[PDB]
Amino acid sequence: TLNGGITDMLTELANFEKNVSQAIHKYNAYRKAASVIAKYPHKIKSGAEAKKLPGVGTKIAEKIDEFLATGKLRKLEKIRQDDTSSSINFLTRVSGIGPSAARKFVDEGIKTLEDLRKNEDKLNHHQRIGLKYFGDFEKRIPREEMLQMQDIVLNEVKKVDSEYIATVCGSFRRGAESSGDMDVLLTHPSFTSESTKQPKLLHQVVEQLQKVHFITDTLSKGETKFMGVCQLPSKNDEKEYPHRRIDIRLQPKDQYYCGVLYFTGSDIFNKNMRAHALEKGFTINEYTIRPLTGVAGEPLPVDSEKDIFDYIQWKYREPKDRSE
DNA sequence: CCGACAGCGCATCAGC
DNA sequence: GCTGATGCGC
DNA sequence: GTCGG
Ligand SMILES: [Cl-]
Ligand code: NA
Ligand code: NA
């Protein structure tokens, strides 16, 4: 990356404000600035140059000036030497443990990986599985593996019901060569926004993927959202694949486009698009787009992803151009 | 200067 | 058990 | 922390 040193600094600051300071808006602010800087096709020479970018203000510009001049940030150096901040930042790396639980664990003396591995009875089910695959969940997923995972999911899904349609979204759909997880969008004609003609639609698919030993664990599971763990099958005498995070989302068939837009991402892209929608007088979720007194109106007709872009007056962006 | 910052499903808890 | 507020991840 | 009213 051209400005990897700068974006890493802002990303580290973002993680600090979220996990330690618990300031979610500062967290989003740093990420937004890091994102727009990452896409900047020039090697930044000064904070003043960066300040021209939307999302970069005075304070970050000062930090950029310090980093370019010294190669480091004194603010981050002090944070790294803070034991409380270090313990919290580590504990939050476990899936299921947020800023509140992390700080609570530190008060109770639980602040290391070794402490967690002898205090599993103090964790909820989500946190326990997150600890179980602490290392694997921080591993990236090669696209080659994502293809194998996709092939398994789609085929096992077909065997349950041919009317099922499974679409792999996330960074994979954006054509990335590596993904953080697998986010599957599932639709079935019996499940629309109007009615649910068949129960256990999500359960059947999860069951099947568990039968073929693809899904190994379950973080959380409901009627429309599944969060769990999956693993590719390895060959004889071969080292096992790392366990992977997989999300399966049952979406209303008639609301596929709003759904596929959200689950495609990226996260920063979604936040920017939804924020821009509000300025245009619209509100967007993974189901519909509505005009917005502040009271949301009736859903607008959507026959493509592009229609959502057209409403908020944006030139259409292919999934590959939504990786911010 | 200063209000608003995207939006939601599942797990968990407390008040009744 | 129902309702609503929180934490959490995305 | 940054932006728009
Ligand atoms: Cl809606
Ligand atoms: Na700016
Ligand atoms: Na966490």
Distance CA A118, CA A276 (A): 47
> Can you tell me the distance from the alpha carbon of A248 to that of A262, in angstroms, rounded to the nearest whole number?
13
Domains and CATH numbers, chain A: 3-82 (1.10.150.110), 83-139 (1.10.150.20), 140-262 (3.30.460.10), 263-323 (no CATH)
Is A200 considered catalytic here?
Answer: no
Q: What per-residue string of b and e applies to A178-190 under the rule 16 or more CB within 10 Å gives b?
A: ebbbbbbbbbbee
| CB distance A242 to A136 below 8 Å | yes
Binding site of A for K(+), by residue number, is 51, 53, 56, 92, 94, 97
Q: How far apart are CA A191 and CA A287, in angstroms?
A: 13
Q: Distance (Å, rounded) from C-alpha A61 to C-alpha A48?
A: 6
Beta partners for residue A284, in sequence order: A289
Lookup: tokens for A298: 């009736």
CA A22 to centroid of ligand 3, rounded, Å: 13
Q: Which two tokens mark A230? A: 């999956």
Strand C: which bases are under 7 Å from protein Cβ? 6-10
What is the nearest nucleotide to A24, using C1' and CA? B5
Long-range contacts of A174-177 (CB under 8 A, 24+ apart): A174/A264, A174/A265, A174/A266, A174/A319, A174/A320, A174/A322, A174/A323, A175/A319, A175/A320, A176/A143, A176/A323, A177/A142, A177/A143
Resolution in A: 2.2
Q: Which ligand is nearest to the CA of A18?
A: 3
Which of A284, A278, A205 minimizes the C-alpha distance to A247?
A: A205
Between strands A165-168 and A182-187, the pairing is: antiparallel
Minimum-distance nucleotide, CA of A270 to C1':
B6
**How many Å apart are CA A200 and CA A262, to the nearest integer?**
24
How far is CA A84 from its chain centroid?
26
SS3 for A41?
A: coil
Our measurement of CA A226 to C1' D5, in angstroms, reads 42
Q: How was this structure determined?
A: X-ray
